Amino acid sequence: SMSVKKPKRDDSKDLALCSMILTEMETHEDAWPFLLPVNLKLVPGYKKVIKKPMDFSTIREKLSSGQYPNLETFALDVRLVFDNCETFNEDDSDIGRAGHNMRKYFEKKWTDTFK
């Protein structure tokens, strides 16, 4: 509350560390469905159904330009990529499987880097 703070967690490396995690997501072999925005002209249904499209390139641009206020807003966008993927793709599809795999990969890096 006012003049009453928990001890200050060192957040000075969060930016660099989120960048590293993102690099590792970018370079994973199953990243291909996620590297670029879904083409809303060429994919029937996407625009209407997925209210907040997100992809790794858009996360990278937001990261690089100080549009994440803290590491939680960064994780929210990464998770949004996978939540979108599950919303539109059957579990038993290459993309559906890609999304599950990438989510697992992300969540482990996240825990090991920060928790």
UniProtKB/Swiss-Prot annotation:
Tissue and organ expression note: Expressed at varying levels in several tissues, whereas a smaller transcript was expressed specifically in testis.
First-to-last residue of the parent protein present: 2054 to 2166 of 2168
Family: Belongs to the WAL family.
Highest taxon of the lineage: Eukaryota
Subunit and partners: Component of the BRF-1 ISWI chromatin remodeling complex, at least composed of SMARCA1 and BAZ2B, which regulates the spacing of histone octamers on the DNA template to facilitate access to DNA. Within the BRF-1 ISWI chromatin remodeling complex interacts with SMARCA1; the interaction is direct. Component of the BRF-5 ISWI chromatin remodeling complex, at least composed of SMARCA5/SNF2H and BAZ2B, which regulates the spacing of histone octamers on the DNA template to facilitate access to DNA.
Domain Bromo: 9-113
Function, in words: Regulatory subunit of the ATP-dependent BRF-1 and BRF-5 ISWI chromatin remodeling complexes, which form ordered nucleosome arrays on chromatin and facilitate access to DNA during DNA-templated processes such as DNA replication, transcription, and repair. Both complexes regulate the spacing of nucleosomes along the chromatin and have the ability to slide mononucleosomes to the center of a DNA template. The BRF-1 ISWI chromatin remodeling complex has a lower ATP hydrolysis rate than the BRF-5 ISWI chromatin remodeling complex.
Lineage, highest ranks first: Eukaryota, Metazoa, Chordata, Craniata, Vertebrata
Compartment list: Nucleus
Listed name of the protein: Bromodomain adjacent to zinc finger domain protein 2B
